[PDB]
Design a protein around this ligand. Structure first.
Ligand SMILES: Nc1nc2c(ncn2[C@@H]2O[C@H](COP(=O)(O)OP(=O)(O)NP(=O)(O)O)[C@@H](O)[C@H]2O)c(=O)[nH]1
Ligand SMILES: [Mg+2]
Ligand SMILES: [Mg+2]
Ligand SMILES: [Mg+2]
Lengths: 176, 700, 50, 196
């Protein structure tokens, strides 16, 4: 009938928007989809996002295909940061080692894209490096003993200063 | 002719209401039914004619039905109460009241029409009320008529499985007869008036038309399959006795099964016909008497709880001059009697029944006795509410029946009496109209307190105006609602003023230095608030202080841009040099002049009222609705894709929702709703401020 | 001058382009009669610069 | 036919016997005063600041109600006037309010003058249109006075200045007066449409 992509949580598969109405319009029940998703991903840590593909057939039958989580989430978890940087390149949010990049590439090689495209891990590592560049995360060759925490402290103070500046700008705009 | 009619028992009494789209033939069908029952002697038309039904002058001049007409008549061993509903989008209150008072609906469709979204909304109302309905496909003589296409549309976009019971002979000006399915007969009509006084029964031309025979037997097989798939017991009977026969029996058990599927809310019997050409009305009446519920066929919890009392539901009111307060009600339990004290549940009070009768909508008959399950008209009930329960002896946490809910009127106008002396007459007429139609809310505007009318639509407002002009005699004028703007200053500005007036005695001198600045605690003080800061001067300000407050308040009441109230400013008195003997009034005048000059030279800004617009629409109409909202400057706050609907929550100015209901209904073909509630006041951007100023000043 | 300035400024990218004038500002005065339209009476009054 | 050739001579070849900029400023002040009166007084409904300009006879002079009284709101549809400072002029205040064209009928209570808000009706809108026409006529009289002052200045300068120069300046002043009175008529028409 069509192709449906959805970013769904591991266990927080609610029958509400913005996913319930689409499947209801398609015709399949949403309770069955939520139950199937929960039983299939009951062994996955609840809270993480993951892309999935839903196939709807005439007579209102559905099937679920689930891929690996987003590289954004992978790299943010590796760097220990909650949110990415605003000004990419000019500011840096965290540091991810080439070793972490290789681990992420190995764990994500078993996805639909890189499975159908049988390519060496070098291509996946380069893709992860580009994703980190977009994320604003620098990729140092081999440097993590305590400078990671040293950079974490200054990143925290910079984030606090940025929050204060944003609050001041919002207050000035409101008073203007 | 047959005006004198005899009351019958429960099994021989029916109460039903006719619903359809605008100009679908409800009034014509009712007139044809009355003509065949014999109460109506001469056959007329809605254009010229307009007999007992639609008796009002407005309904005669506009060619439409405004208020529901309640009529009583008798069929062959059956006494039936009919309610011709208005069927407009602005009289949904009347439609809902007539659906809630009694069960049983006749949904009339036009063959070459389609969905007719008013039919869809009355269908939703009937589904909510949980009442059985029978589909009558009228207008079969009109060009382009298509019984099959109408049935397909009903199956597709009404979401209800129909049960075809009649097959027309022709469609385009050749519809001269019908073929019944349950009875396997053909009915013909060859005349101008009453079409032969009867219908000619010659069953399938006595085994002579193979095509007609095959079509009729295939239709019978399809109907049997439908009813057997729907009802289980009939499925069991077909399973057990008449499987291979395919010809079960003429009219006993098949009719029982169709009655059950009518009462089970899972099927609607579909009958074709044409009221204007006097065709199919008698078969429609026969099916009405054979299928549509009697009052007790539905197990009423109210009657089950109490039947020995006199429980009744007053659902309509009328304010005729000679009759007085007339009340249309339905009798639920027991037998009602005139000239007996009755008690109200909502108003916990006793009322005397002056007289009681049956409604024929043009005359009074003064019927002495009426039993349960009957629509009745009562005179003398001055204290009456739209939704209330009336009982006797107070048998019984309270015996209260859920009546009619106000449909939240959406269209707004302002009514203008011609003079202050005529204003009391307008107020009395408006009170009478409010007590008659509860959907016509009248309110007083907070600022510039004109009297406003809140109705269901522009047509509703126009007919209310016409009724006020005709019945009470007032030449009133309608106008758009006024927008209460506010004003504020953008930069701090100084001002000086001096007041001298040598009238002779009591010489005085005032010199005021003041400055006005914008305030910052607008969210802290969302109401109109001012900051009043006096500098360190003169050591003592009590009478001078009171004069200061009075003068600055008077100055702030009037604005220098639109004459609108000013708000959210800080006024600081730097110098208040007064001469001995000055009057507080003159001090206030000087300060008012100084503040007016300050606000004039202050780079002023205008603020509009903002409210919450909550619009519920479909999916195919969401894009035009959002485009119209953006055109009328609605900042979308959220969009929720509800089940088969779309709800948009946004902020829209008051000045840009002038007649929004009509435009929304035009864009959505009538299938849309919206809700409003004022929240805050926002400040216009300079572009909109300049546009408003140019519009107010004309073109420059 | 205003037409050129507005058009070039609004249609030109400041991050990758730069523009300069090559003609001086209007300096040559142009006179119109004004008071009195008959021929003679002296020179006109300065109206604008080119 | 064009029938009226606009002239804007220079104002700068003159600069000394008449100030066309000053005359235009005075005419703009007249227009601004008319607009301010229209905004302050005749909005749709009388306010305490709307009747603050009604002149009242006092000591053989003209004084305003705001000057000789305290005007406030007691009820949402009522105006309370306290003439404590000048209790003598109570009857004069009643006369000013009653023959004022704003349709305010006051009630005398010794000194607490009580003015109800009559209504917003067709009659009230007609009286407001009448007041708008009256105020437009008064503004036209003020503009005529302003033009007469400029003509008097030209007459003062009419002993050594060329006749053609004087005629041209007179034509220019007449053109400015015509433009301003046309603007006044346009504003009055817009206000009348707004009221009705
Ligand atoms: N051709 C044709 N016209 C019909 C037929 N029935 C009704 N009409 C026409 O339809 C128009 C509306 O008739 P009416 O009975 O008042 O319909 P209504 O549903 O009561 N209108 P409303 O909802 O406003 O009260 C009239 O012009 C009438 O002649 C029919 O069977 N054929
Ligand atoms: Mg029509
Ligand atoms: Mg019509
Ligand atoms: Mg009708």
């Amino acid at each position: 009938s069509g192709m449906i992509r959805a970013i769904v949580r591991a266990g927080q598969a609610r029958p509400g928007p913005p996913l319930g109405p689409i499947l209801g319009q398609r015709g399949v029940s949403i309770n069955q989809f939520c139950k199937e998703f929960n039983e299939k991903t009951k062994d996955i840590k609840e809270g993480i996002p993951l892309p999935t593909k839903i196939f709807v057939k005439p007579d209102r039958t559905f099937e679920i295909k689930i891929g690996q989580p987003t590289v954004s989430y992978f790299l943010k978890a590796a760097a220990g940061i909650e949110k990415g940087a605003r000004h990419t390149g000019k500011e840096v949010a965290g540091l991810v080692t080439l070793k972490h990049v290789y681990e992420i590439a190995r764990v994500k090689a078993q996805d639909d894209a890189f499975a159908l495209q049988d390519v060496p891990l070098s291509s996946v590592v380069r893709s992860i490096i580009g994703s980190a560049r977009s994320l604003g995360i620098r990729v140092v060759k081999d440097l993590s003993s305590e400078e990671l925490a040293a950079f974490q402290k200054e990143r925290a103070l910079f984030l606090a200063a940025q929050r204060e500046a944003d609050l001041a700008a919002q207050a000035e705009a409101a008073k203007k | 002719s047959l005006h004198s009619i005899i009351n019958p028992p429960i099994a021989k009494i029916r109460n039903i209401g006719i619903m359809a789209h605008i100009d679908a033939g409800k009034t014509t069908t009712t007139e044809r039914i009355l003509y065949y029952s014999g109460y109506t002697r001469s056959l007329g038309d809605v254009d010229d004619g307009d007999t007992v039904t639609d008796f009002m002058a407005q309904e005669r001049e506009r060619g439409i039905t405004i208020q529901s007409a309640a009529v009583t008549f008798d069929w062959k061993g059956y006494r039936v109460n009919l309610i011709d509903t208005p069927g407009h989008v602005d009289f949904t209150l009347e439609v809902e009241r007539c659906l809630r008072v009694l069960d049983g609906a006749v949904a009339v469709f036009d063959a070459s029409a389609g969905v007719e979204a008013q039919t869809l909304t009355v269908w939703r109302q009937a589904d909510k009320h949980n009442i059985p309905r029978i589909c009558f496909l009228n207008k079969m003589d009109k060009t382009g008529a298509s019984f099959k296409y109408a049935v397909e549309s009903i199956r597709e976009k009404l979401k209800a499985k129909p049960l075809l019971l009649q097959l027309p002979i022709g469609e385009a000006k050749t519809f001269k007869g019908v073929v019944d399915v349950v009875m396997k007969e053909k009915l013909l009509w060859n005349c101008n008036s009453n079409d032969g006084k009867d219908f000619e029964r010659k069953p399938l031309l006595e085994m002579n038309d193979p095509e007609l025979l095959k079509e009729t037997t295939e239709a019978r097989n399809a109907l049997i399959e439908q009813v057997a798939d729907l009802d289980d017991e009939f499925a069991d009977l077909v399973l057990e006795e008449f499987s291979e026969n395919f010809d079960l029996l003429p009219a006993e058990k098949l009719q029982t099964a169709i009655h059950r599927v009518t009462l089970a809310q899972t099927a609607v019997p579909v009958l074709c016909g044409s009221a204007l050409k006097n065709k199919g009305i008698q078969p429609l009446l026969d099916a009405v008497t054979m299928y549509l519920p009697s009052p007790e066929e539905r197990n009423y919890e109210f009657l089950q709880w109490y039947k020995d009392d006199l429980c009744a539901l007053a659902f309509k009111v009328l304010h005729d001059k000679q009759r007085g307060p007339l009340v249309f009600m339905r009798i639920y339990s027991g037998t009602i009697k005139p000239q007996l004290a009755i008690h109200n549940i909502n108003g916990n009070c006793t009322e005397r029944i002056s007289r009681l009768l049956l409604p024929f909508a043009d005359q009074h008959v003064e019927i002495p006795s009426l039993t349960a399950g009957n629509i009745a008209l009562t005179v003398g009930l001055k204290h009456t509410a739209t939704g209330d329960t009336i009982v006797s002896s107070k048998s019984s946490e309270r015996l209260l029946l859920a009546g009619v809910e106000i449909p939240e009127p959406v269209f707004f106008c302002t009514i203008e009496p011609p003079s202050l002396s005529k204003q009391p007459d307008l107020e009395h007429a408006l009170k009478c109209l409010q007590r008659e139609d509860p959907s016509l809310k009248v309110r007083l505007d907070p600022d510039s307190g004109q009297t406003v009318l809140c109705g269901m639509g522009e047509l509703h407002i126009e007919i209310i105006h016409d009724r006020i002009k005709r019945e009470y005699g007032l030449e009133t004028y309608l106008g758009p609602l006024q927008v209460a703007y506010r004003e504020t200053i953008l930069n701090s500005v100084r001002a000086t003023d001096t007041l001298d007036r040598t009238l002779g005695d009591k010489r005085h001198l005032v010199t005021v230095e003041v400055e006005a600045r914008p305030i910052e605690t607008s969210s802290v003080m969302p109401v109109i608030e001012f900051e009043y800061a006096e500098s360190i001067n003169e050591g003592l300000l009590k009478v001078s202080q009171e004069a200061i407050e009075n003068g600055i308040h008077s100055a702030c009441l009037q604005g220098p841009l639109l004459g609108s109230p000013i708000q959210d400013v800080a006024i600081t008195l730097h110098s208040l040099t007064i001469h001995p003997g000055t009057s507080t009034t003159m001090i206030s005048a000087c300060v008012s002049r100084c503040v007016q000059k300050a606000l004039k030279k202050a780079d002023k800004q205008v603020l509009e009222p903002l409210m919450n617009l909550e619009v519920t629409v479909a999916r195919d109409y969401l894009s035009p609705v959002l485009a119209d909202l953006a055109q009328r400057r609605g900042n979308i706050q959220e969009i929720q894709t509800r089940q088969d609907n779309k709800v948009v929550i946004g902020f829209v100015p008051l000045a840009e929702i002038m007649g929004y209901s009509t435009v929304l209904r035009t864009l959505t073909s009538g299938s849309a709703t919206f809700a409003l509630e004022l929240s805050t006041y926002q400040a216009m951007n300079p572009q909109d401020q300049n546009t408003l100023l140019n519009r107010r000043s004309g073109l420059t | 001058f205003e037409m050129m300035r507005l058009t070039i400024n609004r249609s030109m990218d400041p991050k990758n382009m730069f523009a300069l004038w090559r003609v001086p500002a209007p300096f040559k005065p142009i006179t119109r009669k004004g008071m009195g339209q008959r021929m003679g009476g002296g020179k006109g009054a300065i109206d604008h610069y080119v | 036919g064009q029938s009226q050739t606009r002239v804007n001579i220079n104002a700068a070849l003159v600069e000394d016997i008449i100030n066309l900029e000053e005359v235009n400023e005075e005419m703009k002040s007249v227009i601004e005063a008319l607009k301010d009166n229209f905004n302050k007084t005749l909005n749709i409904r009388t306010s305490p600041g709307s009747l603050d300009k009604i002149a009242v006879v006092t000591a053989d002079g003209k004084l305003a109600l705001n000057q000789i009284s305290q005007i406030s709101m007691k009820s949402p549809q009522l105006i309370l006037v306290n003439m404590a400072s000048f209790p003598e002029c109570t009857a004069a205040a009643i006369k000013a309010i009653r023959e004022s064209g704003m349709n305010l009928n006051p009630e005398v209570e010794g000194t607490l003058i009580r003015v109800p808000i009559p209504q917003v009706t067709r009659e009230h809108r007609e009286m407001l249109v009448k007041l708008a026409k009256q105020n437009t006529n008064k503004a036209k009289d003020s503009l005529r006075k302003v033009r007469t002052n400029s003509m008097n200045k030209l007459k003062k300068s009419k002993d050594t200045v060329s006749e053609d120069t004087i005629r041209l300046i007179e034509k220019q002043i007449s053109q400015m007066a015509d433009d301003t009175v046309a603007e006044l008529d346009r504003h009055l028409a817009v206000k009348t449409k707004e009221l009705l």
